[PDB]
């Protein structure tokens, strides 16, 4: 999960941020202008991402303990009604009265075990930890940020655009392919084909970019 | 799902394109400048979720068959093997062997349930229709495209920028207390909640954004 977290944030950071300031660079646009708008997209990306992560994550950590809530009280009320529900869960697989009749009666007496069934198959089985909850912003506002840097570092250092645009095009192809690796040697394997896609994905949307930076430009003699 | 894939992203297309549009208008850049950072990043970020949506749905695809495979190998090579991790199962909820045993030998004849069980335990039950994978990415590339283009479109319009930024201040912040809502109308309640939350996330960021827009321009006279 923070595994995750942190290297999907980073690429995110890797691509738009990217994205924008090669399009800028290839509008003729300065150094300092593709900074002033990239450096305003990263911090506005992680300030999205941060809070989107801890207003969702606070959504469910309420909802499935408000959900986890409701149907106790479905159980509790009409313990029949619920015992169908799950009745139907255990009919489901293929399991036959005579054997889950039983089952029910020690679930009627002990409640965490047929509530946490039903439950798992309502609230998907996912209680989940209040801390985490609030480490998977801050890891992904930072790996956001961390990420945007990356393909913006040359444009400090050199002021002429179309000259920090090629820097800043083989650090991060090099920054994308070796955190597309990384999203491989984790989770899906085939780390060199997640390498690669990661790296297209940067292509196709700096591309874009650049078709679109240059469009809206398209009338004007210098970068206005 | 689609429905809070086209809202979901609707969410990131209001803040973001919002919060650099704003920021730039702030460090006194023109109209033209701020469209050409904006739909830079509009686009740039369609692509990015397009085929991020595509590329962790066919990859999830992908493995939870693949692991739907694996499993079974392990259910046929060595029966007992696969037993026991799903004999915890029944196990695990307070379910005494002498019960459950015959029902891992009807299990034993019959594939399906038994699998599906522990598949539901090692793939969390999620076998996941192809074509729905699909209409994800495509409708939260377009949710998203239409999301960016609502705070520009007054600067398309009013080419003093800091003009537009108070049109654009008023539209979006209106669109992000109607998608609020409708975000809260569906999913977790309290739709009135929502609607203030999606707008405060529009505020820090664009605040942040203006923070670093002005930042960074800080030595120049005009806008460079
Ligand atoms: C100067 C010469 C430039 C040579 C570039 C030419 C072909 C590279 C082929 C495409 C890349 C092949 C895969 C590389 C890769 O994925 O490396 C990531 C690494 O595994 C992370 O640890
Ligand atoms: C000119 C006068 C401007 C008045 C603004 C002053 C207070 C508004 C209070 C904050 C907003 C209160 C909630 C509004 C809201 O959420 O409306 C969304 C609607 O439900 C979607 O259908
Ligand atoms: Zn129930
Ligand atoms: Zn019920
Ligand atoms: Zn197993
Ligand atoms: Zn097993």
Same mark, same amino acid.
């Given at each position: ?68 809530? &409701? ?90 655009? &179309? ?62």
């Amino acid at each position: 999960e923070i595994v995750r977290d942190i290297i999907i944030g980073v690429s995110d950071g890797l691509t738009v941020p990217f994205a924008l300031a090669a399009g800028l660079s290839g509008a003729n646009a300065s150094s300092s202008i593709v900074l002033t708008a990239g450096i305003a997209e990263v911090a506005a990306g992680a300030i999205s991402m941060g809070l989107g992560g801890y207003l969702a994550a606070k959504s469910e950590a309420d909802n499935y303990a408000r959900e986890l809530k &409701r149907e106790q009280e479905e159980i509790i009320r009409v313990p029949d009604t619920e015992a169908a529900e799950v009745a139907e869960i255990l009919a489901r697989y293929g399991i036959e009265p005579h054997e889950y009749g039983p089952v029910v009666n020690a679930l009627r007496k002990k409640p965490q075990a047929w509530l946490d069934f039903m439950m798992k198959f309502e609230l998907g089985l996912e209680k989940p930890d209040p801390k985490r909850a609030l480490q998977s912003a801050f890891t992904i506002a930072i790996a956001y940020v961390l990420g945007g840097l990356v393909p913006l570092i040359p444009y400090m250092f050199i002021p002429v655009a &179309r000259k920090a645009v090629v820097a800043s095009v083989i650090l991060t192809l090099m920054a994308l392919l070796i955190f597309g690796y990384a999203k491989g040697y984790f989770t899906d394997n085939k780390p060199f084909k997640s390498a690669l896609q990661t790296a297209l994905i940067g292509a196709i949307a700096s591309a874009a970019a650049f078709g679109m930076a240059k469009a809206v430009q398209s009338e004007n003699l210098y970068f206005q």
